[PDB]
Every structure is written in structure tokens, then in C-alpha cells.
Amino acid sequence: ALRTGWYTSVITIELSNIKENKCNGTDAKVKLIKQELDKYKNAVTELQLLMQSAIASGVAVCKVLHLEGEVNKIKSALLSTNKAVVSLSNGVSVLTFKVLDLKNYIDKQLLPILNKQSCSISNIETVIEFQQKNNRLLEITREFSVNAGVTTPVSTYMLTNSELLSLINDMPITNDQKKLMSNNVQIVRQQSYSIMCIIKEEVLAYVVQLPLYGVI
Amino acid sequence: DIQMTQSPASLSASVGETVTITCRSSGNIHNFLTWYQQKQGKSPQFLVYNAKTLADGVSSRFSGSGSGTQFSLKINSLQPEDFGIYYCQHFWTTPYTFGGGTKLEIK
Amino acid sequence: QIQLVQSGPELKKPGETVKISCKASGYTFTDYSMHWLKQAPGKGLKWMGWITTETGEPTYADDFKGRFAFSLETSASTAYLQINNLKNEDTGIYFCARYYYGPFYWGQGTLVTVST
């Protein structure tokens, strides 16, 4: 199974805008929510600082997504679904994907409770839910922070097993190659890269530079 | 420099008919196109996020379709509200262009 | 809740200088670069350019090069345009917009008429 080429995906994450939480009161649940929100904002900040040949393909795709208009088109694409095939302006057809949706949870659940009742939370399941949802973003941030924004092998925090197989079942390849790549997913994690690309227009996007074996 | 053209440069319909507007791109804008409607001296409010998936807040009678070089907005029923000027724009690549405009008036 | 309130109407004379401002509330101003859209009486809508809200670097459409100048104040969260050497043809309605999911978001216009 000789790796002869690359297939650059694009993995997005809908971020939120943390508007200043104007509520006074330091109950334990509110304090834990505040600590998690602070860790979230810190993750976004370190990622923005992380942004601001084996990865030549991912580098090129990152420079293309930095052009004005491209994120808009990807966002419109992955709008109602959680997977699309957007064709970038330079002719290449990239396979976007939306592996996490944190804007939804943060806004809809947290922001009302934080703003209306002056930060009075009732149950303790919401804080565990939020830290569970946020741990994946924090761990992507940690991996990028340590590896200088280019991570190999692609861990299970970047691209889980179900999502790696959903990516493999949509690549433009024969059925034999899909079968091979689905039977050796650990060797496909050990052979790719995860370039960190952009934070812009309220979204986090990184490029997963999967391999493709033309010789089998 | 993808230039768009709308076929019904004028229009006239009843208060219960279904009318269909079309745009033809001068290039392959794969899927990316949208339809604004400008009331009597307002800012153009968009109706669809994309050629197909309409935008939240608007009524369900608007139904867009198309891909590549032939797109179609369909007002499935007219009311006193659905009257103004309808433009169409690609957002595939810069510079962005608009259709000539489709003026819709009562029958 | 994303708002882009714009300046008021104006009346100038050919050969003057004008500055139209656009205030942007409801989001982190530094996320989306702001785009400028010119309308015209009877003609169609015209997209003229944008200005990145991080570096301020502007870029212009080939019909609106030479005199139009975009600028912003990151702190105030507002961006403005400047149309040097007004002419009888620069009359119309000038729009400030940013990228929504697919389409734009238009703030109210500023009818800028140039008569003598």
C-alpha cells in the first residue's frame, strides 16, 4: 500500500463570541461555568496566536482559505449538513466537514442562563456537560500548542475513528482503496498530518492531510 | 468577472399566482448564489443562504433551485408583501456581481 | 441582533470631499472584514471593495480605483469611506456590508447627492 499522493480535507468548528458576562454572584456552579468559559476563551486566544516538503499541500490549502471569501463559501456549504464538498476558487475540490458544534451549545444553553436570571444556575449536570463538550477543543489546543501548529500522527481528538471513516467513505477513490483504508485506520493516522489553518469569521478550521495509496 | 443576467427584466402577477425568476451566470458558480429583495426604499434583505437552502425568517413559499449556470427562484404564492425588486448575486469569487433586477408589480 | 448603522444623508458640490461612516455592533468587529456596496438611481447594485478589519489593508474593484478610500477605527468599532473629488456621477446610495453565512448584511443607506 504505497502512499503516492495526498488528499487535503478541511475540518471546521463553529466557535462562539463570548460577550462579557455581566452578572454578579459567585455561586459554585456559576464559578465553575465561568472557569470553563475562561478556559474556552484562552483556547481561542492561543489558537489565534498559533496561526498568526510534507505539508506543502496543506500549506497551499491554508493560504487559499486565507483569501477573502473562502471561509464564507465553506460556511454556507456546511450549513444544514455536517459534510460537504466545496470547490475552492483555484479549481481544487476540497472535502469540508464540521466535526464539532460548540457555538450551538454555548449560545443556546449557556447564554440565556448567564444573562437573564443574573447567573443563577439550577442543576449541576450543565457544568459537567459543558466541560465534556469543551475538553475536545482544549485538547486540540494543547496538541497544537505543543507541536507548533502541525500535528502528526492525527490523534483521536483531531479526527475520531467514526469521522475518519466517514471521511474515507467520501474520498474520490476506488472501492478497494476505501476498503483498505477502512481496514487499517491506525496506519492511516500514522501517515498523515493535521495542519492548523485559520480562525476567521467565527470559525476554527484545520486541514487534515490524509494519504492516498495509488499502488495496491 | 462572472456577469449575471436575469430573464424577466419586468414582471407582473396576481395575488395568488406562482411566478418564477431565473438567473444565468457567465461562468460556473458551482452552487453559490443568493436572492435579495428590496422594498420601497430599504436595504436589500436576502431570501436564501444558497441556491437551495432558503434563509430562516422568510416564508416557505420562496424556493430556490439550480447549480452551475442556471438558477431559479420561485415564489409559490404572491401576497401584498412579496412585491419589490429581486436581485441575484454570486459569492463564488471577487468581484461580486448582481443581476439586472426584476421588478415585480401587481397584475 | 447584528447591526450596521450608517451615517446620515448628505448634500455636497462637485469637487468636494466626503466621508461616510458605518458603525458595526452585535459581533466582534475584528472577525469579519467589511464590504462596501454602491447603488445608483435606476442602475444596478455595484460592489466596490472591502477592507480587512485586522490590518486595515483595503482592496478595490476595478471601477472604484483612484479616489475612493476605506478606513476604520478598530477601537471605536466603526469603519468609514472617503470619496475624494466628488462628481455629478458619484450620486446615489452607498452601503456597508459584511459576510453573513452566504449573503450580505446591508445597513441602511446614505443618499449622497452631488449637485451644484
Coordinates of C-alpha atoms in Angstrom, one line a residue, chain A:
Chain A
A1 CA 0.0 0.0 0.0
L2 CA 2.4 2.7 -1.3
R3 CA 1.4 6.3 -0.5
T4 CA 1.7 8.2 -3.7
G5 CA -0.4 11.3 -3.1
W6 CA -2.2 13.4 -0.5
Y7 CA -5.9 14.4 -0.1
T8 CA -6.4 17.6 1.9
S9 CA -9.6 17.8 3.9
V10 CA -10.8 20.8 5.9
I11 CA -12.2 20.3 9.4
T12 CA -14.2 23.2 10.8
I13 CA -15.5 24.0 14.3
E14 CA -18.2 26.7 14.9
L15 CA -16.9 28.9 17.6
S16 CA -18.9 31.5 19.5
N17 CA -18.3 35.1 20.6
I18 CA -18.1 35.3 24.4
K19 CA -19.8 38.6 25.1
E20 CA -18.8 40.0 28.5
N21 CA -20.9 38.1 31.1
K22 CA -22.4 41.0 33.1
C23 CA -23.7 39.1 36.1
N24 CA -22.6 39.4 39.8
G25 CA -22.8 36.4 42.1
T26 CA -20.2 33.7 42.7
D27 CA -22.1 30.5 43.4
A28 CA -20.1 27.4 42.9
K29 CA -21.9 26.3 39.7
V30 CA -21.6 29.8 38.3
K31 CA -18.0 29.9 39.3
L32 CA -17.3 26.6 37.5
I33 CA -19.1 27.7 34.4
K34 CA -17.0 30.9 34.5
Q35 CA -13.8 28.9 34.8
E36 CA -14.7 26.8 31.8
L37 CA -15.6 29.8 29.8
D38 CA -12.3 31.4 30.6
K39 CA -10.5 28.2 29.5
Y40 CA -12.5 28.3 26.3
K41 CA -11.6 31.9 25.6
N42 CA -8.0 31.1 26.4
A43 CA -8.0 28.2 23.9
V44 CA -9.3 30.5 21.2
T45 CA -6.6 33.1 22.0
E46 CA -3.7 30.6 22.0
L47 CA -5.1 29.2 18.7
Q48 CA -5.1 32.7 17.2
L49 CA -1.5 33.1 18.2
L50 CA -0.7 29.7 16.8
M51 CA -2.0 30.8 13.4
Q52 CA -0.6 34.4 13.4
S53 CA 8.0 19.3 1.9
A54 CA 5.5 17.1 3.7
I55 CA 2.8 19.7 4.3
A56 CA 3.1 21.6 1.0
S57 CA -0.4 20.6 0.1
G58 CA -1.9 21.6 3.5
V59 CA 0.2 24.8 3.4
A60 CA -1.2 25.7 0.0
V61 CA -4.8 24.9 1.1
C62 CA -4.3 27.1 4.2
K63 CA -3.1 30.0 2.1
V64 CA -6.1 29.5 -0.2
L65 CA -8.6 29.6 2.7
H66 CA -7.0 32.8 3.9
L67 CA -8.3 34.5 0.7
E68 CA -11.2 36.8 1.3
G69 CA -14.5 34.9 0.6
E70 CA -13.4 31.3 1.1
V71 CA -14.5 30.7 4.6
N72 CA -17.8 32.2 3.6
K73 CA -18.2 29.8 1.0
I74 CA -17.3 26.8 3.3
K75 CA -19.7 28.0 5.9
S76 CA -22.5 28.3 3.5
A77 CA -21.6 24.8 2.3
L78 CA -21.6 23.0 5.7
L79 CA -24.6 24.8 6.6
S80 CA -27.5 22.4 7.1
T81 CA -25.5 19.3 6.8
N82 CA -22.3 18.3 8.6
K83 CA -20.3 17.4 5.5
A84 CA -20.0 19.0 2.0
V85 CA -17.6 19.1 -1.0
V86 CA -16.7 22.7 -1.6
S87 CA -14.8 23.7 -4.7
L88 CA -12.2 26.4 -3.9
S89 CA -11.6 29.3 -6.2
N90 CA -8.4 27.9 -7.6
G91 CA -10.1 24.8 -9.1
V92 CA -9.4 22.3 -6.3
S93 CA -12.3 20.4 -4.8
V94 CA -11.9 20.0 -1.1
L95 CA -14.0 17.9 1.3
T96 CA -15.0 20.0 4.2
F97 CA -16.5 18.6 7.4
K98 CA -17.9 20.0 10.7
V99 CA -16.7 17.7 13.5
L100 CA -17.8 19.9 16.5
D101 CA -20.5 22.4 17.0
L102 CA -19.8 24.4 20.2
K103 CA -21.4 27.7 19.1
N104 CA -24.8 25.9 19.3
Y105 CA -24.4 24.6 22.8
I106 CA -22.7 27.7 24.2
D107 CA -25.2 30.2 22.8
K108 CA -28.5 28.4 23.2
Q109 CA -27.9 26.7 26.6
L110 CA -25.4 28.9 28.5
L111 CA -26.0 32.5 27.4
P112 CA -29.7 32.7 28.5
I113 CA -29.0 31.3 31.9
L114 CA -26.0 33.6 32.2
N115 CA -27.7 36.8 31.1
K116 CA -31.4 36.7 32.2
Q117 CA -31.5 35.4 35.8
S118 CA -28.3 37.2 36.7
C119 CA -26.3 34.0 36.7
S120 CA -28.4 31.6 38.8
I121 CA -27.9 28.0 37.7
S122 CA -30.2 25.3 39.0
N123 CA -28.7 21.9 38.2
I124 CA -25.1 20.5 38.2
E125 CA -25.4 18.5 35.0
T126 CA -25.0 21.5 32.8
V127 CA -21.4 22.2 34.1
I128 CA -20.4 18.6 33.5
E129 CA -22.0 18.7 30.1
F130 CA -20.1 21.9 29.2
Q131 CA -16.7 20.7 30.4
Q132 CA -17.3 17.4 28.4
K133 CA -18.1 19.4 25.3
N134 CA -15.1 21.8 25.8
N135 CA -12.5 19.2 26.6
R136 CA -12.0 18.3 22.9
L137 CA -11.4 21.9 21.9
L138 CA -9.0 22.2 24.8
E139 CA -7.1 19.1 23.8
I140 CA -6.8 20.2 20.1
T141 CA -5.4 23.5 21.5
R142 CA -2.9 21.6 23.7
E143 CA -1.7 19.4 20.8
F144 CA -1.3 22.4 18.5
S145 CA 0.4 24.5 21.2
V146 CA 3.0 21.8 21.8
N147 CA 3.6 20.7 18.2
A148 CA 3.9 24.2 16.8
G149 CA 0.6 24.0 14.8
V150 CA 1.4 20.9 12.8
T151 CA 0.4 17.6 14.4
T152 CA 1.4 14.1 13.3
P153 CA 0.0 11.5 13.9
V154 CA -3.6 12.7 13.7
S155 CA -4.8 11.9 17.2
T156 CA -8.4 10.9 18.2
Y157 CA -9.0 14.4 19.4
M158 CA -8.4 15.9 15.9
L159 CA -10.3 13.3 13.9
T160 CA -12.2 10.5 15.7
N161 CA -12.5 7.0 14.3
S162 CA -16.1 7.4 13.1
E163 CA -15.2 10.7 11.5
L164 CA -12.1 9.3 9.9
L165 CA -14.2 6.5 8.3
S166 CA -16.8 9.0 7.2
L167 CA -14.0 10.9 5.5
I168 CA -12.6 7.8 3.9
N169 CA -16.0 6.7 2.6
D170 CA -16.3 10.0 0.6
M171 CA -12.8 10.4 -0.9
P172 CA -12.6 10.1 -4.7
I173 CA -11.0 6.7 -4.8
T174 CA -11.8 3.1 -5.9
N175 CA -13.8 0.8 -3.6
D176 CA -10.7 -1.3 -3.0
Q177 CA -8.9 1.7 -1.6
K178 CA -11.8 2.6 0.7
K179 CA -11.8 -1.0 2.0
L180 CA -8.0 -1.0 2.6
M181 CA -8.1 2.4 4.3
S182 CA -11.0 1.4 6.5
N183 CA -9.3 -1.8 7.5
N184 CA -6.0 -0.1 8.6
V185 CA -7.2 3.2 10.2
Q186 CA -4.3 3.2 12.6
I187 CA -1.8 3.1 9.7
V188 CA -3.7 6.0 8.1
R189 CA -3.4 8.0 11.3
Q190 CA 0.3 7.2 11.5
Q191 CA 0.8 8.5 7.9
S192 CA -1.0 11.9 7.7
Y193 CA -0.7 15.4 9.2
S194 CA -3.1 17.9 10.8
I195 CA -2.1 21.4 9.8
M196 CA -3.7 24.3 11.8
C197 CA -5.1 26.8 9.4
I198 CA -7.4 29.7 10.3
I199 CA -9.6 31.4 12.8
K200 CA -11.7 33.9 11.0
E201 CA -15.4 34.9 10.6
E202 CA -16.1 33.0 13.9
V203 CA -14.9 29.5 12.9
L204 CA -11.9 27.3 13.6
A205 CA -10.6 25.3 10.6
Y206 CA -7.7 22.9 10.4
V207 CA -6.6 20.8 7.4
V208 CA -6.1 17.1 7.7
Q209 CA -3.7 15.9 5.1
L210 CA -4.8 12.3 4.5
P211 CA -2.8 10.0 2.3
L212 CA -4.0 8.1 -0.7
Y213 CA -2.4 4.9 -2.0
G214 CA -2.5 4.7 -5.7
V215 CA -0.5 1.5 -5.8
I216 CA -2.1 -1.5 -4.0

